Amino acid sequence: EPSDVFIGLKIDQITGINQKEENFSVVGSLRIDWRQPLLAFEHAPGEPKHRTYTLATFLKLLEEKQIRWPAFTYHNQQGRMDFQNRLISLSEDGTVMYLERFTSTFQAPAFDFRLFPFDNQLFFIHVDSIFPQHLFRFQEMQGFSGLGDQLGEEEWIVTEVNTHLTTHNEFTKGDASRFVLEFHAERHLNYYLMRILIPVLLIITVSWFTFFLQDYTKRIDLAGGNLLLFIAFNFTISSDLPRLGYITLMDAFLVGTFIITALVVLGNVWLRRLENHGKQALARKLDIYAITSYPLAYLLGALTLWLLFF
Amino acid sequence: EPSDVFIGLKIDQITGINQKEENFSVVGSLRIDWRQPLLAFEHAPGEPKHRTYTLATFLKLLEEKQIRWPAFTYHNQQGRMDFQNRLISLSEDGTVMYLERFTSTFQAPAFDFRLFPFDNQLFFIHVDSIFPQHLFRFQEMQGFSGLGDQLGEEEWIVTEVNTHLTTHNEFTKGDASRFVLEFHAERHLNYYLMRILIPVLLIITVSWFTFFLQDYTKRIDLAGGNLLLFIAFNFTISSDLPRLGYITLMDAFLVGTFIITALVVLGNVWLRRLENHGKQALARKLDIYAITSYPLAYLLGALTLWLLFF
Amino acid sequence: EPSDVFIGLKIDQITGINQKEENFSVVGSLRIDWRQPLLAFEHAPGEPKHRTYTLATFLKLLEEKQIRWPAFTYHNQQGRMDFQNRLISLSEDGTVMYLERFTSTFQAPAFDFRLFPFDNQLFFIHVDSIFPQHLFRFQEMQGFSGLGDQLGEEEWIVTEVNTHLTTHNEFTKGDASRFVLEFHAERHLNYYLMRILIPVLLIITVSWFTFFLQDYTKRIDLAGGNLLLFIAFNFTISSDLPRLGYITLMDAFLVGTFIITALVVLGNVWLRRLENHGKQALARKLDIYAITSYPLAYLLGALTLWLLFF
Amino acid sequence: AAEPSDVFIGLKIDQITGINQKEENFSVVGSLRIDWRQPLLAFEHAPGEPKHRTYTLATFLKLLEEKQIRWPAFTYHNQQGRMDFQNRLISLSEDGTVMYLERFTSTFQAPAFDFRLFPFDNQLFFIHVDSIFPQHLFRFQEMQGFSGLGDQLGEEEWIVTEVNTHLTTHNEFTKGDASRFVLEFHAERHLNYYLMRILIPVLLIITVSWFTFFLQDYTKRIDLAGGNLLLFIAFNFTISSDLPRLGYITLMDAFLVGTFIITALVVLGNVWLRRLENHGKQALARKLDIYAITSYPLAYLLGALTLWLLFF
Amino acid sequence: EPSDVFIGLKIDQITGINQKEENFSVVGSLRIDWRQPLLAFEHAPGEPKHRTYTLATFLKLLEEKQIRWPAFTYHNQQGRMDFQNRLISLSEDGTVMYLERFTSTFQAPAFDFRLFPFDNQLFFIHVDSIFPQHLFRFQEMQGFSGLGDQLGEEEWIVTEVNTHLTTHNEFTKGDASRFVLEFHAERHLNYYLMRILIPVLLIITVSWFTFFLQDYTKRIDLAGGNLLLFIAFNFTISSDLPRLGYITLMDAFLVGTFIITALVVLGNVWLRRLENHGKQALARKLDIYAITSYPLAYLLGALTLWLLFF
Ligand SMILES: CCCCCCCCCO[C@@H]1O[C@H](CO)[C@@H](O)[C@H](O)[C@H]1O
Ligand SMILES: CCCCCCCCCO[C@@H]1O[C@H](CO)[C@@H](O)[C@H](O)[C@H]1O
Ligand SMILES: CCCCCCCCCO[C@@H]1O[C@H](CO)[C@@H](O)[C@H](O)[C@H]1O
Ligand SMILES: CCCCCCCCCO[C@@H]1O[C@H](CO)[C@@H](O)[C@H](O)[C@H]1O
Ligand SMILES: CCCCCCCCCO[C@@H]1O[C@H](CO)[C@@H](O)[C@H](O)[C@H]1O
Ligand SMILES: NCCc1ccc(Br)cc1
Ligand SMILES: NCCc1ccc(Br)cc1
Ligand SMILES: NCCc1ccc(Br)cc1
Ligand SMILES: NCCc1ccc(Br)cc1
């Protein structure tokens, strides 16, 4: 007959989410309730009903009594887990109450940058029983598992928190318990506005003003610089993210400005060429297209992407 | 009956405050006084009245005597806590004197960048009893808790230090002790002056000089460069801070220069356009307005923000 | 007679591959099966058939019974190995079942940047027996060793995973077991396209447009800038990689643009020189060569490398 | 026992891994040596057993706990973060003289930093070793012939002027006066880097700029000095990062603003010369111009003595 | 009588050489052979001749038997040493065989950047006996100490490996053993060529082309830019190295281009000045000197340094 293990997990802090390395880091507390009849003991009346053990001696106790503990791993843990507290409280009955406080990093392979920066992502911690269900089944320790109030994370904000149970088959042939803490969060886009969109629009608009000079050479020299600017903005954003083998929304928007700004150069080159072959008057007539093409192309291009991605 | 636990905490050093990751790091000493009658002992004459234990053996002693120790966590601790000393002194009377020296990082989610760089911030360490008040109540260990003299931090300087007790309900249903060390500090604005304001004003002023040349094309080319400069200064500052979903004061000041410098372009474009359509004399008349718009706009804009934020 | 040790190793995560420091990092689980007759035990009915030990006490047990354990090292391990679980299960038969979960970095000196970024690389973990084959032989633990599904790595993608055994002679004169987990992976070229090729082609193309202006001075000033741009792109890429004593494909492609763009300068200098010595008409004739030389040389140069490297 | 026992503290820095002026700390590999005679620890030895017993710190402390003997607990007051230990080894003599060796790499807070004269300055580095227990229980004495700095420190920027050791009290955990052993050293910066990477360039920019005054294009001088400004604004960011977010003004801090003020005026001035040209007074400008050509060099060297007097 | 301790040390990997912090990091295995008669033991026939101990219990054994172990430090170790294996094999005869596998950083104060980047450097690990020679003398464990095959290091390549004994006087008055593993290595100049020399020569050469335009203003504007470029290249290289109080070869080469490029500016200023005072014809005569000065100056200057440094 297999004994129930009551798995509770609360994330107190999100220390940060490194989206480039596709992981996040949390301060968190794991809580386990587990009745083991064999661990139960007798007290004299007036001697305490509850024994408080360091994890160190509590396991050395279990080893001595040849009792199996419900050994568990965090499947998506990365690197070290700095433990704060690992503390056991045992009762007359042989109910074990375990607390594990830790800061640690976790894999989140559920990262989809397709709609970056307008994206919503799945973050989750997996807690697996090493031992199969035929020995230990995990049950939800109700009234504990979730996320806290002061997470300290300013970019992401969390949509929903859910806890669910399931199997794995990592070390066993047999089905084995896995407690899961999931959360979805999505980005506060202020940064992306204030530092990327606003500037790129400011560059584009203030550039368009200088079309009313009707120096075609100046427009060419301007758009040529704009190109390098965007090629930089392309490097800014490229670093935020991993070396993805797919094309971001952001990725597309940049190549947008590329294509346009490439043509702005080519077009004004041709207008300027007419001026150079005694057809200045034509250019100046023709020119009106070029002045109104500029802004339409960027706003035709705005709907082009917005439909392709939404 | 619940036994009193006397919690003292002194921050010797502030190793630094990482405002981007919304945490700070301190060298600090935790001091606990706790009378446990059961631990009291008799000595032979010539054998010491105070027994000095490593935390390691002191707990192994408590486990052996089935005595519960007032287990505590630092709630806002991040990552590892490098311990220097963990030393126990047990008096005849059964008074435990504990010392914990450590360097460690702590969450400070009390970060409000609304008035950055003119801001005052709350930094605090929480020390929680894991066990409820029905078992242990924390009392302020007088004559210890506070901040030192040589903190070593050059940017922030501390306004006020306060200590107080209160409850939590982290692992218990029952109310539980929490000792709090708060401090407020505010930024030394010298850096922000010397590296950000002075330059931006220098750029703006030295730019305005070149208005007295009365080349409109040159002013357009100048203000266009100024734009990119500010777009950079925008990236400098953006990195100091997190990816906030709210707009800094600083954030606004930058977009200020943006809006203005955008118009300086638009305006001089129009003056230059008049020159290009045989209305050079008009431009040169209007020009006088344009020369005295530059300085007013930046100083109209100075009061615009200084009213909006204060 | 030497006893068989059944070595399984599964990489759950690739935390990343630092190609500059010629190493990779993995979350992984090591599994060892090893029958030791001496460890075998009898149980009372109602006492467990399988005894579960912490590695700590399991070795202290082996030391006490003067039994030699099949000590192993990871030969290509770098720095610390953060252990998650080190857990032993001893059956009545005296079969030891060991599990070691860890995050760790490993050397991969099998790095050939000759065809970077179009390259396929060998990543491997070596597990050596410290003790010779005369004492312990390693055997492939079937049904476990390999790579998982959720590796979390976005740039590389894995072609093939193989396991095989072999000898070493690291500390012994005698032949000694070595279990090897190899994998090959190759790069997703999207990044290299979107951030390096597309820009460099965009710069080159939009530059060629400005040839139809037939300002030779402008072409010289342009190609001179292009040079510095490529000299930067040269620094971008240089950092991705180590300080290799061999020439990358990428390395060559950069020098290509160098040589060409150097020529464009020299050539247009000469065209411009003719203009300056009353031979403007000649230049304008010869110019047609220069206009079509530009694009040919970049695409002659494309086949030059694509033949030299393939 | 027979009053307070003397404890002989020796500390030698074998190397300085580096000095991070931005975090106002330094990191050293060092060996701490303590001599401490305890009558109670003295033991009788059977012939064929060594006269000196060699213990790991862990066993030696577990032994002290067992024998209910209090050891002279000590902390490094200015230690920062983790201290990796190389060796912790105890040798117990028949006489009961305890010999402890602690080898470690560690970072130490140093609030002694004064950037007022940066980069031309000397700074004070110190490690504090505080006894937790008061002076009435234990007094620290200088273990002579050991304390100091080594030969191969490995540090190329700083070079050390003087090493001094002395003892004093603290009152950290006790009401009672308590021992504190101090290892101080002063070092000062090698100016070559600051020359080769900051001064030489800034002078090169300034001088090569002044050459282009002999062109007598006023527009070109304006465009040049405007660029010079941005250059210095960069050099301002280079240096700003070397240092913390100080609330005071460095020497270097001042020197940068110097170039600012000057280069701002060079613009303003040539703007005015150019303005005369634009209002048919080209001849005047060309007269005045001679003042302007000699002003640039004077102002930079008037400005050199301005600071060198204000700061020295 | 003092007992011999057989010290072997093999570097398996060079994880890297941080030339800025004047240290290097290696994966390595320390091997010690040491006969202690007291550690010898008797076995029953059929009970093992060799006892295999964790370092942990092996020392607790030595402490119990009041035997002194040949305590050693790595003198030039920096920071933490991550240990892989610390394993003892005790024979009946009382021969201890010790293995210490570790990744660790080591000081190399033997750094001479005088001829950087054409330099050859000394890297060494010191292993000191804490105890004097009157108690333990170190002897070279032969057939093991040296460097491995797959070091993984791409910039440096190792010239020679030598091992030898010597004294120290670190904690003792008495002479004390020190085993030394030295190696020399020298740099692969490919990086320095491909990223620094080639570009600087490309800039200089492509600049010289624009002399054949015979625009003196353009040459001034060009050389002025070249200056800033080199001032950057000066910052690139400055960071590779520490804040050395001595002048590199590289250091000199840069100041070379400085001095020259400063004069190119001055000289063309003077040519241009002649044009401005009706002496255009003279300038155009003198010009031939200036055109052939530039190339000679850089190649006079190339031999100047190649003499002073070689
Ligand atoms: C740049 C957006 C602002 C537009 C306003 C018109 C003047 C622009 C400022 O100078 C221009 O900046 C480009 C970007 O670097 C350069 O390529 C170009 O040669 C230069 O003339
Ligand atoms: C530059 C701010 C300081 C004001 C000095 C006035 C003289 C002009 C200095 O050079 C300017 O630098 C910008 C920055 O990129 C260029 O874009 C711009 O076209 C260029 O004219
Ligand atoms: C720069 C090395 C390549 C030289 C090719 C000759 C044409 C000039 C190329 O662009 C130039 O870049 C320089 C560096 O900032 C500026 O001084 C210069 O005014 C600018 O036009
Ligand atoms: C730059 C590739 C875009 C080609 C479009 C033609 C118009 C000019 C583009 O700006 C150029 O940018 C360089 C910065 O490195 C400068 O050196 C160069 O003098 C400048 O004119
Ligand atoms: C540049 C300092 C070196 C002095 C050399 C004198 C020749 C002119 C070099 O080009 C200048 O470079 C500045 C970069 O700051 C540009 O902003 C400015 O428009 C331009 O005039
Ligand atoms: N490192 C996991 C140890 C452990 C597991 C379960 C329980 Br209940 C107590 C301790
Ligand atoms: N980890 C518990 C440490 C502790 C020791 C003694 C006292 Br009194 C309070 C706390
Ligand atoms: N430090 C790991 C030693 C070990 C190796 C294999 C087995 Br099976 C048990 C223990
Ligand atoms: N944690 C080190 C404690 C200690 C150090 C030196 C001596 Br002598 C005794 C004790």
Ligand SMILES: NCCc1ccc(Br)cc1
């Ligand atoms: N910490 C290492 C101590 C030691 C030294 C030598 C040998 Br042989 C065994 C142990």
